[PDB]
Amino acid sequence: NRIKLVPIAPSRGIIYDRNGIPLALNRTIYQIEMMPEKVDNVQQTLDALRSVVDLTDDDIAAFRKERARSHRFTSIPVKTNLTEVQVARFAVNQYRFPGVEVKGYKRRYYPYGSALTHVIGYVSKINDKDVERLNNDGKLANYAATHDIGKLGIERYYEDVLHGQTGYEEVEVNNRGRVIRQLKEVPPQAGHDIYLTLDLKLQQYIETLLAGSRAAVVVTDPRTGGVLALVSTPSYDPNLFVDGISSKDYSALLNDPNTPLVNRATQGVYPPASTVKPYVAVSALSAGVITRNTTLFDPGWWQLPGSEKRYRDWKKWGHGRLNVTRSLEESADTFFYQVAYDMGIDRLSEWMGKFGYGHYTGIDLAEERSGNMPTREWKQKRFKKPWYQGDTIPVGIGQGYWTATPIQMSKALMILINDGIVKVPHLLMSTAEDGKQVPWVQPHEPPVGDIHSGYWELAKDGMYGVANRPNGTAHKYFASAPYKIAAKSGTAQLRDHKLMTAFAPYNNPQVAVAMILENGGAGPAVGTLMRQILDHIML
Ligand SMILES: *C(=O)N1C[C@H](NOS(=O)(=O)O)CC[C@H]1C(N)=O
């Protein structure tokens, strides 16, 4: 009688929000299955199982077809999703059905569904590119009994910790290959539980605010860089994929022109526009090409020296006399056109790159785009034409070749809040299992510019003005708040993309928000939605 070794799959770790609410759970699902070769009389067995587990003609139909579409000595399921009564009935009848097995499979469950789709992700059936990627990473050995895998979001980024360590059992089998006894069991070890920085009730609220629009919101705590909410709408139900998604259901997702499969927060690539003016400002003050007192007269436009090329301000007849404070307050373009010209693309890209633009943020998701912070070398490689000085000008106001993601906006915003300290936006607070907590540790990111310098306060004071002073572009959204709001909006490029960044309270910022409504959103203005979000958080 031969002794077989049989892998035991591990139980997948739980994902919890910042308050211990489980966001990704396991459910056991029961089926009876058989290897027909190991079943003496298949027909007799099927018919007697009508009585025992309420086996139906359709169940048998599905059985024989799946029996065809399967390799020799494959275990064919006979009946799936058994009720507990049905398992108990089969259990007390097990001895009549040698070669029929009852088995439990842990499946993944997402209780809050579409509110956490892009950030949490889903696990679903392993396919051939999963196999390949596991075999390159040299992890395949540990999946001998594992059949699902993180496909995106946190479920994929942390697949390795969530999965656990496969175990194994020694079982005795008879002449016909049926297990009669278990000799030894070396149990698996559950994957680690992971605790996220997310606030689930804040994420559901924001998802409610965003209803109908193509939008992304990132909310962070700038004191820690944690992601309190990262939502992309429209979304979809991650539970659809867990037990295998309908191709009807799946083609409906891909064919949605509102592209709900896209994580807009990390893969949405847009011109950052005016939202960059605070960072361009800090950069110019540090570079020394402007001053707290630098002033220019804006007629509503700006002309490139040695050229008839004129760039426009949004105010048709100008903002009159502008310094950096007032330019941030009223989101003047002319001031920043000039700043860009003086900075030069070289210095300008180098500084904006230090705020994170054009680079991956370091967030712990695998779905991410880097956007584009243009350089001479990049323009050369991408178009084999050299850099012209008029290419620098729109970069001053976050346009031209410049594109960024809302998670990049977030990183940059937090740097400004922290006076050049670079905090990576992250979702993981800690790991666990087996009882030992490992906290998420910030990678070494050297600061931007200089901490002691007073330019950080200057640019932030301007954002306070945007939100609070009568000439600020966002006064109507934020002035009346008890806590002090600082903000900076932008408009990009069908209708225009509406962007808003903000943080609160201004004295001791507890929350940072970058958000964007594609083509203006479906209802409220982005400034109204920002107020409501900052209200919900601060009460
Ligand atoms: C920045 O994107 N801009 C300057 C100004 N911002 O106004 S908004 O934030 O209220 O949309 C006008 C739009 C835009 C520009 N450069 O035109």
Q: Which residues in the chain are immediately followed by a break of C to N over 2.5 Å?
A: 493
Method: X-ray
Bridge pairing between strands 15-16 and 194-196: parallel
Distance from C-alpha of 355 to C-alpha of 89, rounded to nearest angstrom: 64
CA of 11 to the centre of ligand 1 (A): 51
CA of 206 to the centre of ligand 1 (A): 24
Which runs of consecutive H residues, i.e. helices, occur in 396-474? 406-417, 455-468
Rg (CA), the chain: 29
* Nearest protein CA to atom 7 of ligand 1, as residue: 490
**Which atom of ligand 1 sits closest to the CA of residue 498?**
11
What residues are paired with 428 via a beta bridge?
196
Distance from C-alpha of 322 to C-alpha of 318, rounded to nearest angstrom: 9
Kindly list the catalytic residues.
274
Resolution value (Å, 1 decimal)? 2.3
DSSP string, 472-497: STTHHHHTT-SSPPEEEEEEE---PE
Distance from C-alpha of 221 to C-alpha of 168, rounded to nearest angstrom: 43
Distance from C-alpha of 406 to C-alpha of 337, rounded to nearest angstrom: 23
Q: Which of 415, 280, 411, 414 is nearest to 348 (CA)?
A: 280
CA of 244 to the centre of ligand 1 (A): 45
**Which pair of structure tokens corresponds to residue 67?**
């029996």
CA of 331 to the centre of ligand 1 (A): 6
**Which pair of structure tokens corresponds to residue 219?**
């909310």
Q: Choose which residue among 319, 488, 491, 493 to substitute to test ligand 1 binding: the one with the highest number of ligand atoms within 8 A of its C-beta.
A: 491
Residues 6+ apart with CB under 8 A from 480: none
Amino acid at 391: D
Ligand 1 pocket, CB under 6 A: 273-274, 314, 331, 333, 397, 473, 489-491
* Nearest protein CA to atom 14 of ligand 1, as residue: 491
Q: Which of 110, 339, 143, 355 is nearest to 241 (CA)?
A: 110
Tokens 């439990």: give the residue.
104
DSSP string, 128-194: HHHHHHHHHTT-GGGGTT--EEE-SHHHHHTHHHHHEE-EEEEEEE-TT--EEEEEEEE--EEPPPE
CA of 171 to the centre of ligand 1 (A): 70
Distance from C-alpha of 200 to C-alpha of 118, rounded to nearest angstrom: 14
**Which pair of structure tokens corresponds to residue 333?**
């373009």
**Which atom of ligand 1 sits closest to the CA of residue 314?**
17
* Nearest protein CA to atom 17 of ligand 1, as residue: 314
Collapsing DSSP states into helix, strand and coil, what is residue 398? Answer: coil
Is residue 414 within 8 Å of residue 356, measured between CB atoms?
no
* Nearest protein CA to atom 1 of ligand 1, as residue: 274
